[PDB]
Amino acid sequence: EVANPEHYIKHPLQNRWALWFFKNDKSKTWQANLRLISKFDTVEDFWALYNHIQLSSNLMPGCDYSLFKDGIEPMWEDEKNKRGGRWLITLNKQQRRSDLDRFWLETLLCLIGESFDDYSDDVCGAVVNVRAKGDKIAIWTTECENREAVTHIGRVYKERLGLPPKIVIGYQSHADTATKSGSTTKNRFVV
């Protein structure tokens, strides 16, 4: 006989994930400001990471956390992001207090838990942008023309965040965001 694995194994995740930090430093390039923190592939290792790092609401203005599948960089130019897009959550200055950290943790748990049913493989990662003008959280998916997957991911995410039907969230392709005239980008989808 051997030991019962239930008693001592860490609980593996479907994917290895990488947490990244973007430091707002205008004296350096974007590339120099984006660094890996670390990677993990079990539930226990996720919590060891999350438990020791600052909440998003305590980061300096202009900084980001990103959690992406191992081997996908948190930039739209990556092979797995270039044809993709994001479900965008915009927060006002009051939601910094009431919602930012709860929403970001919920987002992490959606990712690591593979919460998108048959469409989990379309998910690349998520980003939280801590900004004076208003915070943002987004789930990034790999193909903006996978209508079924994108719509499914949106509904799941909306309901996991606990947003009421009244609240509307939008999906924007990275290409559209990159080429947008003016402040607002058109939504390919809404839920």
């Binding site: 609980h11 479907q14 539930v43 226990e44 919590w47 690591i112 593979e114």
Partner: peptide
């Protein structure tokens, strides 16, 4: 495939 509910993830923090 490995799927965890939200509940399960929180429980494994303890």
């Amino acid at each position: 495939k490995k799927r965890y509910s939200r509940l399960q993830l929180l429980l494994f923090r303890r």
